[PDB]
Design a protein around this motif. Sequence first.
Motif, mmCIF file in Angstrom:
data_model
loop_
_atom_site.group_PDB
_atom_site.id
_atom_site.type_symbol
_atom_site.label_atom_id
_atom_site.label_comp_id
_atom_site.label_asym_id
_atom_site.label_seq_id
_atom_site.Cartn_x
_atom_site.Cartn_y
_atom_site.Cartn_z
ATOM 1 N N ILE A 101 0.832 -1.166 -0.062
ATOM 2 C CA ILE A 101 0.277 -0.121 0.022
ATOM 3 C C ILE A 101 0.811 1.462 -0.200
ATOM 4 C CG2 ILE A 101 -1.622 1.380 1.600
ATOM 5 C CD1 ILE A 101 -2.891 -0.892 -0.108
ATOM 6 N N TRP A 132 -23.905 5.296 -2.975
ATOM 7 C CA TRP A 132 -22.711 5.223 -3.647
ATOM 8 C C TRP A 132 -22.545 5.611 -4.978
ATOM 9 C CZ3 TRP A 132 -21.155 2.371 -7.943
ATOM 10 C CH2 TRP A 132 -19.621 2.554 -8.285
ATOM 11 N N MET A 168 -20.195 8.603 -6.037
ATOM 12 C CA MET A 168 -18.941 8.591 -7.013
ATOM 13 C C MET A 168 -19.105 9.683 -8.082
ATOM 14 S SD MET A 168 -16.631 6.819 -5.547
ATOM 15 C CE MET A 168 -15.522 6.355 -7.185
ATOM 16 N N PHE A 206 -17.987 13.042 -6.603
ATOM 17 C CA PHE A 206 -16.564 13.017 -6.382
ATOM 18 C C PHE A 206 -15.907 13.114 -7.932
ATOM 19 C CE2 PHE A 206 -12.705 10.321 -6.483
ATOM 20 C CZ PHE A 206 -11.958 11.138 -5.795
ATOM 21 N N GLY A 208 -8.744 8.404 -14.754
ATOM 22 C CA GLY A 208 -9.478 7.442 -13.702
ATOM 23 C C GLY A 208 -10.751 7.704 -13.459
ATOM 24 N N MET A 209 -11.527 8.047 -14.297
ATOM 25 C CA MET A 209 -13.084 8.324 -13.913
ATOM 26 C C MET A 209 -13.619 6.819 -14.283
ATOM 27 S SD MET A 209 -13.559 11.444 -13.429
ATOM 28 C CE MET A 209 -11.795 11.255 -12.562
ATOM 29 N N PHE A 210 -14.459 6.351 -13.265
ATOM 30 C CA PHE A 210 -15.110 5.056 -13.409
ATOM 31 C C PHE A 210 -16.627 5.014 -13.593
ATOM 32 C CE2 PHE A 210 -16.937 1.196 -10.972
ATOM 33 C CZ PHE A 210 -16.394 0.282 -12.067
ATOM 34 N N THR A 222 -1.669 2.430 -7.720
ATOM 35 C CA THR A 222 -3.252 3.076 -7.605
ATOM 36 C C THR A 222 -3.253 4.565 -8.573
ATOM 37 O OG1 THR A 222 -2.776 4.630 -5.763
ATOM 38 C CG2 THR A 222 -3.194 2.043 -5.212
ATOM 39 N N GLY A 223 -4.441 4.812 -8.704
ATOM 40 C CA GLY A 223 -4.953 6.149 -9.402
ATOM 41 C C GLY A 223 -4.995 6.105 -10.743
ATOM 42 N N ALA A 224 -4.986 7.268 -11.245
ATOM 43 C CA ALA A 224 -5.479 7.591 -12.538
ATOM 44 C C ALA A 224 -4.188 7.396 -13.557
ATOM 45 C CB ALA A 224 -6.138 8.680 -12.953
ATOM 46 N N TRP A 227 -9.336 -2.203 -14.473
ATOM 47 C CA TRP A 227 -9.851 -2.442 -13.179
ATOM 48 C C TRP A 227 -11.321 -2.937 -13.156
ATOM 49 C CZ3 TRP A 227 -6.608 -2.678 -9.526
ATOM 50 C CH2 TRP A 227 -5.628 -1.761 -9.559
ATOM 51 N N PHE A 228 -12.186 -2.588 -13.843
ATOM 52 C CA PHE A 228 -13.595 -3.394 -14.019
ATOM 53 C C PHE A 228 -13.188 -4.722 -14.216
ATOM 54 C CE2 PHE A 228 -18.079 -3.065 -14.836
ATOM 55 C CZ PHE A 228 -18.190 -4.127 -15.466
ATOM 56 N N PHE A 281 -0.870 -12.443 -3.098
ATOM 57 C CA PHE A 281 -1.693 -13.750 -2.993
ATOM 58 C C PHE A 281 -0.816 -15.093 -3.265
ATOM 59 C CE2 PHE A 281 -3.995 -9.794 -4.603
ATOM 60 C CZ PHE A 281 -4.938 -10.032 -3.782
ATOM 61 N N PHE A 291 -8.035 0.205 8.541
ATOM 62 C CA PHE A 291 -8.171 -1.076 8.289
ATOM 63 C C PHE A 291 -7.729 -1.876 9.895
ATOM 64 C CE2 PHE A 291 -6.067 -5.386 7.387
ATOM 65 C CZ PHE A 291 -7.231 -6.061 6.460
HETATM 66 C C1 CLA Z 1 -15.170 -3.072 -9.094
HETATM 67 C C2 CLA Z 1 -15.351 -1.810 -8.671
HETATM 68 C C3 CLA Z 1 -14.614 -0.744 -8.733
HETATM 69 C C4 CLA Z 1 -13.454 -0.129 -9.836
HETATM 70 C C5 CLA Z 1 -13.309 -1.018 -10.985
HETATM 71 C C6 CLA Z 1 -12.905 0.985 -9.614
HETATM 72 C C7 CLA Z 1 -12.202 1.499 -10.445
HETATM 73 C C8 CLA Z 1 -11.046 2.717 -10.010
HETATM 74 N N1 CLA Z 1 -11.558 3.435 -8.943
HETATM 75 MG MG1 CLA Z 1 -13.113 3.330 -7.733
HETATM 76 N N2 CLA Z 1 -14.217 2.954 -5.958
HETATM 77 C C9 CLA Z 1 -15.057 1.684 -5.767
HETATM 78 C C10 CLA Z 1 -15.049 0.569 -6.647
HETATM 79 C C11 CLA Z 1 -14.660 0.364 -7.909
HETATM 80 N N3 CLA Z 1 -13.599 1.518 -8.382
HETATM 81 C C12 CLA Z 1 -15.792 1.828 -4.621
HETATM 82 C C13 CLA Z 1 -16.571 0.726 -4.144
HETATM 83 C C14 CLA Z 1 -15.317 2.930 -3.718
HETATM 84 C C15 CLA Z 1 -15.668 3.510 -2.601
HETATM 85 C C16 CLA Z 1 -14.588 3.273 -1.369
HETATM 86 C C17 CLA Z 1 -14.580 3.656 -4.768
HETATM 87 C C18 CLA Z 1 -13.635 4.811 -4.508
HETATM 88 C C19 CLA Z 1 -12.858 5.432 -5.267
HETATM 89 C C20 CLA Z 1 -12.102 6.802 -5.073
HETATM 90 C C21 CLA Z 1 -12.200 7.403 -3.919
HETATM 91 C C22 CLA Z 1 -11.122 6.834 -6.040
HETATM 92 C C23 CLA Z 1 -11.388 5.405 -6.763
HETATM 93 C C24 CLA Z 1 -10.511 5.414 -7.912
HETATM 94 C C25 CLA Z 1 -10.560 4.411 -9.047
HETATM 95 C C26 CLA Z 1 -9.542 4.404 -10.201
HETATM 96 C C27 CLA Z 1 -7.912 3.699 -9.440
HETATM 97 C C28 CLA Z 1 -7.862 2.597 -9.163
HETATM 98 C C29 CLA Z 1 -8.486 1.954 -7.948
HETATM 99 O O1 CLA Z 1 -9.415 1.811 -7.462
HETATM 100 O O2 CLA Z 1 -7.281 1.814 -7.078
HETATM 101 C C30 CLA Z 1 -6.277 0.786 -7.232
HETATM 102 C C31 CLA Z 1 -6.918 -0.327 -6.416
HETATM 103 C C32 CLA Z 1 -6.199 -1.092 -5.391
HETATM 104 C C33 CLA Z 1 -5.199 -0.510 -4.884
HETATM 105 C C34 CLA Z 1 -7.047 -1.999 -4.587
HETATM 106 C C35 CLA Z 1 -6.189 -3.385 -4.572
HETATM 107 C C36 CLA Z 1 -7.305 -4.581 -4.337
HETATM 108 C C37 CLA Z 1 -6.963 -5.573 -3.391
HETATM 109 C C38 CLA Z 1 -7.223 -7.036 -4.066
HETATM 110 C C39 CLA Z 1 -7.625 -5.428 -2.094
HETATM 111 C C40 CLA Z 1 -6.993 -6.023 -1.121
HETATM 112 C C41 CLA Z 1 -7.498 -5.682 0.372
HETATM 113 C C42 CLA Z 1 -6.652 -6.196 1.473
HETATM 114 C C43 CLA Z 1 -7.335 -7.385 1.876
HETATM 115 C C44 CLA Z 1 -6.760 -5.432 2.453
HETATM 116 C C45 CLA Z 1 -5.420 -4.371 2.676
HETATM 117 C C46 CLA Z 1 -5.265 -3.600 3.948
HETATM 118 C C47 CLA Z 1 -4.362 -2.591 3.668
HETATM 119 C C48 CLA Z 1 -4.907 -1.352 3.280
HETATM 120 C C49 CLA Z 1 -3.706 -2.322 5.154
HETATM 121 C C50 CLA Z 1 -10.114 3.262 -11.021
HETATM 122 C C51 CLA Z 1 -10.850 3.868 -12.252
HETATM 123 C C52 CLA Z 1 -9.571 6.694 -7.934
HETATM 124 C C53 CLA Z 1 -9.507 7.310 -9.319
HETATM 125 O O3 CLA Z 1 -8.579 7.693 -9.953
HETATM 126 O O4 CLA Z 1 -10.465 8.268 -9.345
HETATM 127 C C54 CLA Z 1 -10.489 9.573 -9.912
HETATM 128 C C55 CLA Z 1 -10.088 7.495 -6.692
HETATM 129 O O5 CLA Z 1 -9.548 8.391 -6.252
HETATM 130 N N4 CLA Z 1 -12.339 4.764 -6.524
#
Ligand code: CLA
Lengths: 31, 38, 482, 145, 45, 351, 35, 65, 73, 31
Positions: free
Chosen positions: B36, C32, C36, C39, C58-60, C326-328, C449-450, F195, J13
């Motif tokens: 992270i 949600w 989003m 945001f 990075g828009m979703f 992470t990020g866009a 990501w999707f 993983f 977390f």
């Molecule tokens: C499947 C659903 C989905 C998808 C495809 C996306 C896709 C995207 N989101 Mg969105 N988002 C979602 C759901 C989703 N989001 C939800 C439910 C929320 C609410 C919390 C958000 C809130 C959100 C914000 C606030 C932002 C995004 C952003 C983004 C973009 C950057 C990539 C990313 O998410 O970070 C990369 C993803 C990861 C690093 C996650 C890794 C996944 C692993 C497997 C999880 C493992 C967890 C582990 C068990 C515990 C870890 C603990 C540790 C933290 C200590 C991308 C377009 C960013 C962006 O560019 O938008 C402008 C941004 O700013 N999203």
Amino acid sequence: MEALVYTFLLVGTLGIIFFSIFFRDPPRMIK
Amino acid sequence: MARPNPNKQVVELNRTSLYWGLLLIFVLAVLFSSYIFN
Amino acid sequence: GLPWYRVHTVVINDPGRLISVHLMHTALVSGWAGSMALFEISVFDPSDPVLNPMWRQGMFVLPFMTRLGITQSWGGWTISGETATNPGIWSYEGVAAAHIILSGALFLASVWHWTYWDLELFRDPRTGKTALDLPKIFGIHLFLSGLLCFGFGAFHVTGVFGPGIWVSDPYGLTGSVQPVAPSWGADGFDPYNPGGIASHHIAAGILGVLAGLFHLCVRPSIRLYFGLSMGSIETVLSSSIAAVFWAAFVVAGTMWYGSAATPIELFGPTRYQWDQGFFQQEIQKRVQASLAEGASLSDAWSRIPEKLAFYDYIGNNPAKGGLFRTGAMNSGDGIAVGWLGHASFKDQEGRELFVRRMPTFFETFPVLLLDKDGIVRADVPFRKAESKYSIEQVGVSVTFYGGELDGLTFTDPATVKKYARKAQLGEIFEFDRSTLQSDGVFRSSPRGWFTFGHVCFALLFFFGHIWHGARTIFRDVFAGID
Amino acid sequence: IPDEEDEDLVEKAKANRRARLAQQRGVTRDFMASENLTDRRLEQELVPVQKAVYKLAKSGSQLESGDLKGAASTLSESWVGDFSTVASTVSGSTTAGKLVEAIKSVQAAAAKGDAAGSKRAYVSLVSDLQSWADASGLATSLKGL
Amino acid sequence: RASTEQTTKRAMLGLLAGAVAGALLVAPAEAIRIPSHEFTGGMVK
Amino acid sequence: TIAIGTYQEKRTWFDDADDWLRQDRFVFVGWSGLLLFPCAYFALGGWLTGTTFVTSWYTHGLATSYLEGCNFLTAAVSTPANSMAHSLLFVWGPEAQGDFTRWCQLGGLWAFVALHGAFGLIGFMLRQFEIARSVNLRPYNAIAFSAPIAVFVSVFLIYPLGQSGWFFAPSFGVAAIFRFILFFQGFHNWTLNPFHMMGVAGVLGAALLCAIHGATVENTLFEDGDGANTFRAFNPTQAEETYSMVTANRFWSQIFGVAFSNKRWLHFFMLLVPVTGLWMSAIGVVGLALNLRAYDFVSQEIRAAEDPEFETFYTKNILLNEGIRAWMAAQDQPHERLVFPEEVLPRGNAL
Amino acid sequence: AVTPSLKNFLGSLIAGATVLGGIALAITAVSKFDK
Amino acid sequence: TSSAVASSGLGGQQGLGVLAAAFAIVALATAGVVLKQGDETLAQVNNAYQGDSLTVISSRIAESL
Amino acid sequence: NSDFQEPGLVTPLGTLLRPLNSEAGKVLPGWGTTVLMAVFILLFAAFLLIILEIYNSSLILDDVSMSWETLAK
Amino acid sequence: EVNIYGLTATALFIIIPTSFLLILYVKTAST
Ligand code: CLA
Ligand code: CLA
Ligand code: CLA
Ligand code: CLA
Ligand SMILES: C=Cc1c(C)c2cc3nc(c4c5[nH]c(cc6nc(cc1[nH]2)C(C)=C6CC)c(C)c5C(=O)[C@@H]4C(=O)OC)[C@@H](CCC(=O)OC/C=C(\C)CCC[C@H](C)CCC[C@H](C)CCCC(C)C)[C@@H]3C
Ligand SMILES: CCCCCCCCCCCCCCCC(=O)OC[C@H](COP(=O)(O)OC[C@@H](O)CO)OC(=O)CCCCCCCCCCCCCCC
Ligand SMILES: CC1=C(/C=C/C(C)=C/C=C/C(C)=C/C=C/C=C(C)/C=C/C=C(C)/C=C/C2=C(C)CCCC2(C)C)C(C)(C)CCC1
Ligand SMILES: CC1=C(/C=C/C(C)=C/C=C/C(C)=C/C=C/C=C(C)/C=C/C=C(C)/C=C/C2=C(C)CCCC2(C)C)C(C)(C)CCC1
């Protein structure tokens, strides 16, 4: 800052291990 | 405010479950923190 | 004393609490969606629609609104880069606010249904015990779903009452929201044909209605009633998990491979376009046609729009990315600002050299300038390694056609080496890196990501389907009864 | 990982991005015309301007001679509004206001006496419209259908 | 060029292969099956 | 009212078929058998034929067959060429055109084996469900098998589907799987993925649990036999358990610190660890299918680039991956037509 | 028009139907013989 | 009799009204779709032919004075 | 309990929708219409195979081109 | 203060699940 976070997480894991070893709920269910 | 629901149980979590959960969360944090933070 | 993982099963019998719970989940998901939308609208930068589109920021959820007809905004801008004068009720902000209001209304309805859980509607006249007539409920719900599908197919996509959907050219240069006339022949089954959507949502729609009617008027056979345990609410859960599982794979596959429902101008290009030289082949064909027509090489390369060249760049490939990057995309290699131009490499002999483009697999790929015959003529040593064919020795020079650096030439080995390393990524481009503090590593587009999220959810839901089907078929053994 | 480089002409490219965006419209349209495809995206919002420019050109041609006072009659036959709204879409409430002010002013001048003032206003309007077309990047598409 | 260079070893090996295979296939199957008769012979389902 | 019970109607062809299928013979056929026995059979057959006669000369430029002079370790059923991107490679499809020899040469045998094996796995899981229902038992074996089937589905279908074609799926062979492993190490840094780390933990912990449980059960046995051999001092119809739970609990509570006190929880833990590990591995490989790999540690890369006098084991692993990729791509991916001169091949002495 | 690939696919449908019918007839015949 | 009442009610309402509404909506929508696909596929605006003069010459007529 | 712990609340919408949730458990004798279900399942499987092979380029038809190039009609 | 969002993610977390588990344990221990 990252080093402090890592050390805190490791210390927390060690403390949980210690508490589980010594402050466990007594196993009278079968004994 | 109509009638008490008979289907009302309570969640129970013994100490071993608490220790397992704390260990799981802390170990997952240890594993994923370096990723992270990059 | 239920365990922490069997908690919600307290709602497995009373339908009123189940309805309240489902209303709460619906409210959460709608909230949600609205949050989003808000945001992303706050973070979106609409000034540049050519080199800084949605998928690069990075828009979703923005592309999903645009795919169905939401273009304008209350800020005065449009997803087109133009300016809107009368946004109307249905804009990005309007849709987000509508979803939030719906979330709140569903929350209130949820609390009401939770309070007044005991309703006569849920008790059958005979035996006076809580029960749901699942076959007839399914019939009603299928009738409604088919009606809505038919309405969407025959009033929204076809444009007779609605706005249409997003149709674009093959190369994603000029796309917009237009009506889609249905296509009924065999050409309605290739998913790169938008018409196939509309026709589908009619045909299936109608069938739904009919099917619904059947399921309202025909009772299940006793053999089927006991075989699938239609009296239990858990079999329906297993089947629904399987259905959403299947849909998750289908949508993930269409997103990854491309379709008429996932235009490259909203979600970005696919990796199979880079692998097969789609945009590169189109650009080359246009340049060759212009040359045959008779024109200067600079003029021929200056008639290729910046958008098409931008698509021909490995950085836009969804495959090039990282799980924890992470990020866009803009935060990986910076915000694109201009097109330097096509780089042509010529050695001292005079024969043109072409750079070997980086395949998708390779995180780092050596640079190899090779002639038209596939023979390697120049390259850069690995790292201060003894060199026999090198930029300094072979003395290759790079000339730029089109773009900002039109007509310029370079001979100093440092600049030729730098532009050769930039060229293996595809078309050369110019990046502002100091605005977002981009580190310099490629990120993945919304496509990646999707697809990743939905395939992961599909596998988890396969496990869920297995577990719930097992707990349905083996109900007596799990309950320890006759 | 790719390095910084990129020198410092990034500011130059970023400063005048609007002009390049405007100019790219003509290149894209020529690309589509050569590819034998239909834009179906910018041509729809361009036919009203095409008709507007034809009608204004005819108004000028038949007004310069001063042989017909109907210039004002055909000037506002429910086509100026479409041009105004599409121009505002392209630019928005700043240039469109100037264009509508100019067109109404020339219409009034023609309706009054078709005097030298009307001709001067028409010439100014034509110059302003040409400059606006050049800035918007559509100048290559307006003329010659 | 690829072609077998041995003429009569084929039959000699085949006879032994069949003779061994018969016994080696009947015996372990017997050993595994007798318990199957025992289990499915009065206490099943 | 006109009520009803269960099976109070006339018999039907389905009843006769069900009665015949669910008999008590050496091999339980059941309904799932109709899907399992054929499919699985062909799969095995395919592989054996694949490893005995057909060749991968026209797909990979390799020789993998007993007829070509290969061992058991090197023989394999190689994946089709990258040109056949995701074609299912039916015998009657546009590629093979109905010609069996050209079908074998094109690599369709791999697709045959993979698809029939996937359906055989489905049939086997259904068979486990059917057996459990027949003997009135909870089907936890079905979930325990849901683990490996998920791993198989991921690795052998989702990874190639997300990549350029079947060419990059594992080839059914020992050396082929070793090539797959080294390819992942070189190109994806699969060892650094969280993983695969979770999966490794699960698998190694499963082995540890198996060994410890066996040793503890065999070394806390109750003396219910005069003879010095403790295996005959037991019959299946016993009333009490054959090992002392109290003694084992005390031993592992005094040696290790914590110990089990519930047979059900212990055996469920044994079931749980491997399943969770393999599911995590499957999720990781699904991520890799889209080249969403854990590779960067961007801060380390930046620091290493800034000053050459900073070397961590991560940087050395990155260099080793560069070497693997550069020296493998020439022959592992013949469709790329790569000719790396010795000058540009990465080397340690060039650092 | 009926392309060769379409003809082959239809033939595949026929062949798979034949295989399913063969399995069904086998189970039917043996079940009837034993009961 | 509970099922008798349910059967009468369903056979009436869910046997007539649902069919009527479904048929009405489907007929309306399909008729509209067919009419708009077979009659109006392109937008037609404006009229008349005009190529005699272009703005450049008219502008060039009134700059001397 | 008596009538599952006294009758539940009565609302106008509850009485309106009561018929749709009254006949719970009613079934037809024998196999009913399972054969039609099997026929429709087989037809649906054929349809899914057709679309999968069209989208997989294992079934090339004249009208379909199966590429981005079809977006230009 | 480097990677503020990463620190926030780690803290949340570690806190939310920990607080949830401790609250459940305290609630059940009263029995
Ligand atoms: C499947 C659903 C989905 C998808 C495809 C996306 C896709 C995207 N989101 Mg969105 N988002 C979602 C759901 C989703 N989001 C939800 C439910 C929320 C609410 C919390 C958000 C809130 C959100 C914000 C606030 C932002 C995004 C952003 C983004 C973009 C950057 C990539 C990313 O998410 O970070 C990369 C993803 C990861 C690093 C996650 C890794 C996944 C692993 C497997 C999880 C493992 C967890 C582990 C068990 C515990 C870890 C603990 C540790 C933290 C200590 C991308 C377009 C960013 C962006 O560019 O938008 C402008 C941004 O700013 N999203
Ligand atoms: C339509 C979806 C659906 C629905 C309605 C249910 C409903 C139910 N499931 Mg099933 N299940 C599903 C999907 C679903 N599940 C899937 C996809 C899986 C695979 C992982 C499972 C696996 C599963 C198991 C293994 C078990 C259940 C059980 C249950 C019951 C109790 C709920 C529970 O676990 O306690 C409530 C659980 C919690 C409060 C813990 C939540 C903490 C999670 C793990 C992390 C946080 C999640 C996050 C906030 C939101 C994620 C959103 C994401 C889904 C997009 C309930 C009837 C249990 C049962 O009754 O069987 C005896 C049970 O043992 N389910
Ligand atoms: C239950 C056992 C079983 C199963 C599940 C499979 C499954 C499979 N086999 Mg195997 N196979 C089997 C038995 C089985 N086979 C047997 C016994 C043989 C020896 C004869 C073979 C020989 C074999 C070969 C040689 C090949 C396969 C292949 C395949 C795959 C393609 C399936 C396909 O398109 O078939 C056709 C599927 C259907 C026809 C589905 C049924 C649809 C019915 C007929 C609908 C009918 C309704 C209606 C009349 C249709 C209207 C439309 C039109 C006619 C108007 C698939 C993984 C191929 C493959 O992919 O290999 C890579 C391949 O090359 N199999
Ligand atoms: C300590 C060392 C170590 C350990 C313990 C593991 C552990 C694991 N790795 Mg490995 N790995 C390591 C180091 C290690 N890794 C290193 C250093 C690398 C280099 C990067 C890799 C590269 C690597 C790759 C590339 C993959 C793994 C995978 C796995 C998982 C294998 C799961 C499994 O059983 O699949 C094998 C089991 C199946 C496929 C199930 C199918 C079983 C069928 C149904 C049986 C068929 C019937 C058969 C004919 C019967 C014959 C029986 C006969 C053999 C007796 C497991 C978590 C794999 C994984 O799970 O990813 C999802 C995987 O793809 N790892
Ligand atoms: C090397 C890894 C590995 C192998 C080979 C393996 C093998 C097996 N495990 C089985 C069972 C299980 N495995 C389980 C958990 C696990 N199994 C694991 C790892 C493995 N398990 C792990 C890590 C776990 C923990 C989750 C459970 C819980 C079960 C069972 O219940 C089951 C059993 O009863 O075991 C006794 C059997 C399934 C029989 C079968 O395929 O059905 C018939 C289907 C067939 C034959 C179709 C498969 C066709 C394949 C896909 C095509 C390729 C075949 C070629 C021979 C490939 C050769 C490849 C070369 C590299 C050699 C089989 C003996
Ligand atoms: C009715 C089938 C009876 C068994 C036939 C022999 C089986 C053994 C085949 C060994 C390989 C030999 C080459 C055969 C292949 C061959 O020669 O095909 C050729 C045949 C016709 O192609 P042509 O040679 O006419 O094509 C020539 C040109 O016009 C091509 O453009 O293709 C078919 O019509 C389909 C045949 C399927 C044959 C496989 C049967 C199994 C089908 C899958 C079953 C699925 C069941 C699913 C249940 C859910
Ligand atoms: C009441 C109402 C109102 C208001 C309301 C509101 C304002 C609401 C809001 C709401 C909201 C604002 C909501 C939100 C929600 C959210 C959510 C629900 C989220 C979720 C998330 C999740 C679920 C996640 C997950 C994850 C992550 C974290 C990442 C990746 C991984 C996973 C997937 C695990 C008013 C006054 C107007 C009026 C009346 C009604
Ligand atoms: C053709 C084909 C098919 C089928 C096939 C099959 C079904 C096959 C089978 C096959 C088989 C079924 C095979 C088998 C084989 C076996 C083997 C090959 C064995 C071997 C063994 C060994 C080698 C051993 C060794 C040993 C032992 C164990 C003893 C002593 C010691 C030693 C180690 C020496 C079809 C038409 C469908 C399709 C196409 C393809």
